[PDB]
Design an enzyme around this catalytic site. Sequence first.
Site, short mmCIF file in Angstrom:
data_model
loop_
_atom_site.label_atom_id
_atom_site.label_comp_id
_atom_site.label_asym_id
_atom_site.label_seq_id
_atom_site.Cartn_x
_atom_site.Cartn_y
_atom_site.Cartn_z
N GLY A 23 0.81 -1.23 0.00
CA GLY A 23 0.00 0.00 0.00
C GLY A 23 0.83 1.26 0.00
N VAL A 44 2.96 0.78 3.17
CA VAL A 44 2.72 -0.49 3.91
C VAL A 44 3.51 -1.59 3.23
CG1 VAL A 44 0.93 -2.00 4.86
CG2 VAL A 44 0.39 0.36 4.28
N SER A 99 2.94 7.86 3.56
CA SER A 99 3.04 6.48 4.09
C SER A 99 3.18 5.37 3.04
CB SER A 99 1.90 6.19 5.03
OG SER A 99 0.71 6.79 4.58
N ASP A 151 -15.98 5.75 4.83
CA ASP A 151 -15.36 5.55 3.49
C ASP A 151 -15.12 4.05 3.28
OD1 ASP A 151 -14.33 6.29 0.93
OD2 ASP A 151 -12.28 6.59 1.77
#
Length: 254
Positions: free
Chosen positions: A17, A24, A22, A132
């Site tokens: 991700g 992941v 950021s 969301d």
Amino acid sequence: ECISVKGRIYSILKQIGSGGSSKVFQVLNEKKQIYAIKYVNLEEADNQTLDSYRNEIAYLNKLQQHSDKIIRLYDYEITDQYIYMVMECGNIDLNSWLKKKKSIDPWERKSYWKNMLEAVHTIHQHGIVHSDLKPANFLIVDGMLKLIDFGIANQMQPTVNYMPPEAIKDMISPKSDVWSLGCILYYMTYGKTPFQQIINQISKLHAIIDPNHEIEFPDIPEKDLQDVLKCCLKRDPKQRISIPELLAHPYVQI
Ligand SMILES: COc1ccc(Oc2cc(NCCC(F)(F)F)c3ncc(-c4ccc(C(=O)NC5CC5)c(C)c4)n3n2)c(F)c1F
């Protein structure tokens, strides 16, 4: 090629991700066990970003005790410069699983539904509304679905198809998450979301709020499932089924 957090070394198998500040990674510790590590670079980050990131770890940490349908958080390191979060790695996100599948075992689809209700119910009891909810936000791990995030920081990514009418009409309650869960359940039963086929996006948002635009619920054997979908997909949040109602519904109980 490696990540350290509160002493311990993890080797990166790959990145899974991305978004804003950021990343992941799927990752191994020294005993060759698999985790997801989230890395947040904070050097260039607004205070509204930081606060969201702090609120997320606080909430993720408190919710661990409450339910196993929330992703586990094993450990974290927070600094003025970075965040590392060591979390459970799943087999696959629900979005990517749905694109493979020729079709879904109706008993598998119900089991997932339950898992999604329990996750979202848990965040509602701590005064969180995700707002969301897409299939990407759920993880398959041991044939059960686990909620991945909380709608509190929102950069991360592996559509407007899941948007509730009232979020658009607002130039939000827990009922907002029921609409999006309804769109995910509708996807799992009909192989599409309800406004999938509408092509341009401006025209999608028109459909989602327009009362005259009726949604089609084709006859299926599971009369109960059909009822859950029609109740989840009412445009009036006040007339729309709640999560505690959904948990008492014959579709999950009978
Ligand atoms: C909305 O943002 C995302 C949605 C789905 C994502 O896909 C996945 C896919 C996983 N499948 C294992 C696949 C593997 F490894 F085999 F390729 C997986 N395992 C743990 C986590 C995971 C856990 C926690 C969090 C997270 O940031 N949670 C918030 C702190 C609450 C995220 C984004 C992903 N994920 N996430 C993703 F990467 C995202 F950034």
